[PDB]
Amino acid sequence: HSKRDASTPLRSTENGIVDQVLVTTNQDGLKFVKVRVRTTKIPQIGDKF
Amino acid sequence: MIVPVRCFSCGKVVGDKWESYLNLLQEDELDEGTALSRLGLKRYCCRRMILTHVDLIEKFLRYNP
């Protein structure tokens, strides 16, 4: 066990489909990632209008 | 986005009438009322469905990705 976990979990209450994944270095030369997840929401009982 | 396939209220197909509608506005030079009337959209819910719609996909296609 030479590694600590630092994984990012999906929102506990939410769900959907991985829309797009972006991998890019930073200004200081740091490999960082932005993952956009898509979820289609349909008007349900209780939705505010 | 793009023209809705069918009317929300009743359920009449309207997606096949979009381009035609546009033609009726630019080719025959008609007003929106007569153009909507000629397409067989008598009920004002479908009439709304086409008249009220904004074709945003034409602006979406402007990007290269």
Next chain:
Amino acid sequence: MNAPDRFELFLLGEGESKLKIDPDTKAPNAVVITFEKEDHTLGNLIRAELLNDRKVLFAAYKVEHPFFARFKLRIQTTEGYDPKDALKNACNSIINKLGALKTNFETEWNLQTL
């Protein structure tokens, strides 16, 4: 999220029977029948057809909650007249009327153009 399946409106669940006939304790010679996976479409018609039977004292349907596709139908007939027979007569009458209506529409349709 917590929304029920759509087919639960017409597909019978596990163990759920179509009709649940129960002896009414209120008035004598009465009955309450639970119709599952059916709505006003059937209830209103059956109830309205039960009122045509002049040997039926009472007939009324109701949907206790719009969430669940089901309705209760209370029937009360005269003595010497089982309510199930009233229901059956009503149903058969409905079927006959619908058959005649279908036939008439079919004959009227063949006489049309465009």
Next chain:
Amino acid sequence: LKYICAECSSKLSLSRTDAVRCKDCGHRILLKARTKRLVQFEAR
């Protein structure tokens, strides 16, 4: 695995220990390619 650049129609296959940038471009904005395992959609 493989990736695809943002502002050009390329198809990089550079795995780890590579990343940025892009082949014949210059920009560092790299996107990930769509999965091969298909997903079904209940058309409703």
Next chain:
Amino acid sequence: EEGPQVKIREASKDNVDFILSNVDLAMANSLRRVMIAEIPTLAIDSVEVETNTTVLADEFIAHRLGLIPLQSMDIEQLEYSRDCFCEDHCDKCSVVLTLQAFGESESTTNVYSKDLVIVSNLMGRNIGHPIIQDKEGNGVLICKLRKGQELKLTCVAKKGIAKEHAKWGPAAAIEFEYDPWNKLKHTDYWYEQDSAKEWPQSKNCEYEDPPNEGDPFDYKAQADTFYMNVESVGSIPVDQVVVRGIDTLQKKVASILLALTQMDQD
């Protein structure tokens, strides 16, 4: 015949304007309800997307495909996937049709419903074919591709009821009106001055006799004459819409009758 009567005032491929005579209100209403929802129809239920580089989202396009009117003529000799003894789906329950579109010209490449190609074996059944009431013969405008955009997917269409989803709706709007002169007085008209002048007169008024002021209110009269106009979408012809409506109502009544027949078991 002997029971209820029909009088087709107008008839077309899309609409049928008729009059129901000698019928109870509940039967007309129930027929309307059945025609609206409870009628079997074929529509896209499953969508498998391979490549989708278009603007529109996956489930967006999928939802658009779900609403596409497909041929449901011989739908009665098709089967529900829930009833078929196969795995997932087969040729006895579902109709599979593919869709392959790609941006070719510099101009916008339109993707219509005509681009859908039937893949599964129809084995002699008139089914699955997307209805095209379009004048140019294109059909429903599904999507729009740019220059290098590609849309590749497959559609598994299954038999379904409009009660489960409105995409399986065989009819659009059903016109319904009884007693145009309010002789039954089921409606207390709202007004500011004159009740008759403010409220527009119905067309169906031309098919009934106006009330006489010298005559009192007819309290023993019910509703016999009903003016209806059924409009189909294309999946099923109008005449067959109302006919299969009647047949469906009758059938689901017969199911209750059968249930009563079965409850006699010890």
